[PDB]
Each structure stands twice: as structure tokens, then as C-alpha cells.
Amino acid sequence: EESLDLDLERSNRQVWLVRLPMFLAEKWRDRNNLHGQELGKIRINKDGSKITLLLNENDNDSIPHEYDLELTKKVVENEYVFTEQNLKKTAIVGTVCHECQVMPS
């Protein structure tokens, strides 16, 4: 579009940044795109905020183990995500509202 321009963060879209263990990501790659690559689900538990990640049964044969997430602060920093398409257009997609680390299990 306008060349060399950046796109639209003004919309204030929020996204989460999550640190994942290398092994888990490796597993995720396995999921088929055709499937839509549903890796598993995220659980939000109350009685305090607890968030965990569990792999889909298809991913591994065993009992799915929950991976606890440690919520973290934004830190004194502003993190924004920008994307570059094949077209090489650049867009300012969203701001990182929350940070989290998925612990290995």
C-alpha cells in the first residue's frame, strides 16, 4: 500500500507474548496445518488466576501433562508486534498486553 509505511496499532489490539520451551514448540510443528494444527488447549482457572497449557491427546500418547504458566509483568518496556507479509507490507498488529512463560513439565 503506501510503500515503506507502517500499519494500524491505533486500534489498540491486544495480544499475549508467551515463552515456550523448545521441546513443546517442536511438538507443535508436528500438528498438521490441514488439521488447523490444533495443538491443545489453554486453561484459565480461577480461585486465583492460573493458566496452563495442555497438549492434545493426538500429539502424544499418554496422559496430557499440564504446563503451568508464570504470569509476568510488561516490564519497563513497550512491546509491539509488527508483521511482514510476503507482499512485504508492514503492519503494526497489536501491543503486548500480557507476558507469560510456559514452564516445562
Partner 1 sequence: DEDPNEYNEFPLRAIPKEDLENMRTHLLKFQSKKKINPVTDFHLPVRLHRKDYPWVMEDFDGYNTWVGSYEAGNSDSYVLLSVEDDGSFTMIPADKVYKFTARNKYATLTIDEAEKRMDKKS
Q: What are the angstrom distances between the C-alpha of 85 and each of 6, 44, 46, 82, 88?
A: 12, 32, 38, 10, 5
- Tell me how many residues contact partner 1 (CB under 8 A): 52
Q: Does 25 bind partner 1 (CB under 8 A)?
A: yes
On whether the CB atoms of residues 93 and 84 are closer than 8 A, the answer is no
User: What would the x/- binding string for partner 1 be over residues 34 to 73, using CB under 8 A?
Assistant: --xxxxxxxxxxxx-----x--------------------
| Three cell numbers, residue 94 | 497489536
Q: Binding to partner 1 (CB under 8 A): which residues in 5-24?
A: 5-6, 9-10, 15-22
On whether the CB atoms of residues 56 and 64 are closer than 8 A, the answer is yes
Interface residues with partner 1 (CB under 8 A) are 4-6, 9-10, 15-22, 25, 28, 31-33, 36-47, 53, 75-87, 90-96, 101
